[PDB]
Amino acid sequence: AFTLADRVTEEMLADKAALVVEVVEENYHDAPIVGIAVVNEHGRFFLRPETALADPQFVAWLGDETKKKSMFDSKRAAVALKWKGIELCGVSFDLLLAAYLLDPAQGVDDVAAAAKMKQYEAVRPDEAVYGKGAKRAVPDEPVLAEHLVRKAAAIWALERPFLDELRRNEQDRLLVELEQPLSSILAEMEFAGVKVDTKRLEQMGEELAEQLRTVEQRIYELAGQEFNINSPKQLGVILFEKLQLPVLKKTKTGYSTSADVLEKLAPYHEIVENILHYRQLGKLQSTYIEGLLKVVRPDTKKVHTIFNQALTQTGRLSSTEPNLQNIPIRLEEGRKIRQAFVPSESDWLIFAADYSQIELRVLAHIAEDDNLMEAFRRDLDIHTKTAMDIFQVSEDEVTPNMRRQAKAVNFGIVYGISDYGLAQNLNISRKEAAEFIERYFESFPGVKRYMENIVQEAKQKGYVTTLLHRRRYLPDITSRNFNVRSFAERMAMNTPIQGSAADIIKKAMIDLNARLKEERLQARLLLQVHDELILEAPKEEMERLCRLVPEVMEQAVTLRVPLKVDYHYGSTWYDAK
DNA sequence: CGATCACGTA
DNA sequence: CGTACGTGATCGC
Numbered sequence: 001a002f003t004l005a006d007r008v009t010e011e012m013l014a015d016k017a018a019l020v021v022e023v024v025e026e027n028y029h030d031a032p033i034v035g036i037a038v039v040n041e042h043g044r045f046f047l048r049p050e051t052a053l054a055d056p057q058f059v060a061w062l063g064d065e066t067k068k069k070s071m072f073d074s075k076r077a078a079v080a081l082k083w084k085g086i087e088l089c090g091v092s093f094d095l096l097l098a099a100y101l102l103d104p105a106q107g108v109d110d111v112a113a114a115a116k117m118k119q120y121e122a123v124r125p126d127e128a129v130y131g132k133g134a135k136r137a138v139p140d141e142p143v144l145a146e147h148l149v150r151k152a153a154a155i156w157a158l159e160r161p162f163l164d165e166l167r168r169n170e171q172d173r174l175l176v177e178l179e180q181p182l183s184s185i186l187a188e189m190e191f192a193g194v195k196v197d198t199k200r201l202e203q204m205g206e207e208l209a210e211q212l213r214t215v216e217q218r219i220y221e222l223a224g225q226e227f228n229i230n231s232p233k234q235l236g237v238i239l240f241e242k243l244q245l246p247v248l249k250k251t252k253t254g255y256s257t258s259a260d261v262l263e264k265l266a267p268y269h270e271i272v273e274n275i276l277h278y279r280q281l282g283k284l285q286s287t288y289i290e291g292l293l294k295v296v297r298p299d300t301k302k303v304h305t306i307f308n309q310a311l312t313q314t315g316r317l318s319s320t321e322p323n324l325q326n327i328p329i330r331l332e333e334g335r336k337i338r339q340a341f342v343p344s345e346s347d348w349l350i351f352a353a354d355y356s357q358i359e360l361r362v363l364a365h366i367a368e369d370d371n372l373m374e375a376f377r378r379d380l381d382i383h384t385k386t387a388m389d390i391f392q393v394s395e396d397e398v399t400p401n402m403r404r405q406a407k408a409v410n411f412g413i414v415y416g417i418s419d420y421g422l423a424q425n426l427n428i429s430r431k432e433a434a435e436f437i438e439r440y441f442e443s444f445p446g447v448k449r450y451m452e453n454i455v456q457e458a459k460q461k462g463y464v465t466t467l468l469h470r471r472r473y474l475p476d477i478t479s480r481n482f483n484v485r486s487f488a489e490r491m492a493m494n495t496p497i498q499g500s501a502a503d504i505i506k507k508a509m510i511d512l513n514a515r516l517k518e519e520r521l522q523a524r525l526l527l528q529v530h531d532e533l534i535l536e537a538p539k540e541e542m543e544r545l546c547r548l549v550p551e552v553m554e555q556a557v558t559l560r561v562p563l564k565v566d567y568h569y570g571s572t573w574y575d576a577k
Numbered sequence: 578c579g580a581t582c583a584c585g586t587a
Numbered sequence: 588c589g590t591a592c593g594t595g596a597t598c599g600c
Contacts, residue, residue, distance in 0.1 A: 134578060231596055232583055253582060283585060286594055312590060323592045326587040334586080415589045424588095487588055494589065530587070530590095 002037075002044040002149040004141075008055040011042040018156040019069040020148050021049075021077035021088075024130055024138055027321055028076045029190070029297075029304045030083040034138050037148035039156045046145035059086055068092040070159050072111045072151065074180075075309070078187045095155050097179045098162040100310035101171050105473060108310070111151040118161045123150040171469050178468060179309065182506050185513050186307045186317075189525050193302035194324070195344040197572075198293060204336070205289040208281055215278045222271040229278055232257045243269055280333070288328065288337050295322050302344065305527075314495055315470045315502035317528055325529045327573075338574035343536045351523070351542065352576040353549045353567035354532035357382055358501045359414040362467070365559035366496060369446025376561040383407040389443035390436065409440050413447070416494025418486060451493050458492035466499035467557065468507070504563070505531060508556035515552050519544070534573065542569050 005012070017040035025031040036047040052058045061067050062081070070093040071077060078088040099108040099117060108114045112125040129147045130136050138144060166172045220226045223242065227234045236255040239245045245265050249256035259276060266272040295303055308318040319325050327341075328334025343349055360382055364372035375385045387398045387406035405426055412422045423433035441448035455477075458464050463473040472495045476488035509528060516523055523537030523545055533553070537545055550565040557563075570576040 132579095228596080230584095230594090233597080251583065256583085258584065279584080283594085287586075287592095291593070308591095314590065316590060318591060320592065323587090325590095326585090326592070328586065330587080412589090417589050421588060483588065490589065498590075 341573035367450035
């Protein structure tokens with residue numbers, strides 16, 4: 001039972017309401033609002049957006065901090081309203097972020113999935129209402145209005161049970177003081193966007209398109225035949241059938257043609273080096289040149305990513321359209337992609353600051369390993385120091401390969417990769433890899449104690465927690481399937497590390513945003529990617545930012561070891577190196 | 578169309 | 588058998 005309102009009335013502008021501002025397009029930037037539902041103490045209302053968003057009282061109610069709203073995925077509504085010059089304020093409860101903190105593994109992506117967690121089923125999933133894929137469409141107003149009111153009614157009914165469970169888990173402050181404030185900060189960053197020099201991307205593309213055409217012609221002469229190099233199965237016929245190259249690894253479909261297999265086949269035939277070079281070049285061309293160009297808004301000539309705040313099981317942010325968290329850096333040919341990201345105003349610069357080894361520093365603090373804490377208190381090179389300890393040699397005697405192997409051990413912790421995966425990584429035997437690990441644990445007995453304890457804790461409690469009380473349930477921790485149990489064990493070890501690092505970065509983002517406003521700076525957060533924050537600011541602000549941003553990031557939390565931030569600035573993202 | 582699969586980037 | 592997102596091909600439709 002609901003009012004399909006033709007006009008905004010005062011009873012819809014109570015100071016506590018469940019609100020639904022429906023944006024059905026997946027990319028909500030500059031996207032239509034198809035309807036509005038308000039549920040409060042006085043009733044349930046469906047409003048047409050062409051009515052409500054033109055009503056000054058409704059817009060003023062939207063923007064009034066003291067008018068508390070409860071929503072699901074408020075960031076989608078806030079950004080969509082920003083593109084119409086309308087501020088959304090006073091969102092005191094976000095059901096999507098509540099459900100994500102309670103159990104990230106549920107994959108809660110609509111109101112109905114969140115409602116299921118509390119045995120509430122009087123709302124349909126969005127997919128049942130809008131369809132999927134090709135058939136996706138907005139239904140007519142009677143069907144649309146009911147779905148929106150039911151979602152608002154669900155939000156109305158579910159706020160108190162979700163808050164009760166958050167408080168029981170000691171996660172109420174995590175929602176109210178971290179994730180929800182962060183959601184506003186991410187909305188501003190998405191709306192601001194990042195300026196892209198499309199002409200530089202296009203000139204790189206023409207460069208790649210000439211080099212690809214050369215390598216591809218080379219590959220056809222070496223195969224003595226033309227074929228689709230991008231088809232792994234065709235390429236596998238060329239390599240393993242016509243060229244009789246040894247089959248070192250088989251996928252479930254057929255033969256593996258991954259980069260790491262191909263580098264071991266390089267000595268046998270000159271086609272291999274060229275296939276590798278075609279793969280790196282075509283990855284840049286298809287994924288990063290034509291990929292980025294496709295999502296530059298031609299009106300703003302910016303990219304406006306969407307940060308997914310309620311996706312990963314560790315608490316890390318994710319980002320899409322474009323994904324800027326996998327923009328090339330390691331290889332120089334690909335690193336130059338970052339030259340395409342420029343300040344959005346003349347006389348501004350890009351400022352990037354990044355945590356140095358935040359994960360291992362979190363580990364040192366969590367495990368209280370005296371050796372690992374001393375290494376960071378001395379600001380050592382952690383890979384060199386780990387090589388010194390593992391191999392029981394002095395700093396003068398650490399070769400590059402010893403350092404590369406200690407580095408692989410350290411990354412095998414930061415990422416929770418398997419005992420087996422270290423062997424694959426170092427290309428060694430597993431008994432070699434596992435003996436590396438035992439020497440590491442003899443050099444770092446606190447890390448070992450931590451790994452044993454956190455696994456036991458995960459089995460005993462059913463989950464692990466981060467510094468700021470995020471949790472990840474690990475039901476596969478009791479599995480009799482060894483491969484399944486091991487992963488759960490590795491996630492027991494890895495999640496308090498990666499997730500605590502994610503907590504710290506999020507807190508830094510909140511602390512920075514407040515400091516920037518306190519300092520009356522024009523600098524704006526643009527991007528968070530792994531352990532890095534990227535800003536743009538006037539040329540005139542670089543010196544103050546050189547002191548402010550690292551200070552804020554280093555003080556976000558206090559651990560038993562210091563946090564270290566590196567920072568640079570330049571006329572492009574690439575140059576902020 | 579759409580879903581599976583193999584590849585790769587961070 | 589790390590956290591992801593995106594591209595291409597293939598194959599059923």
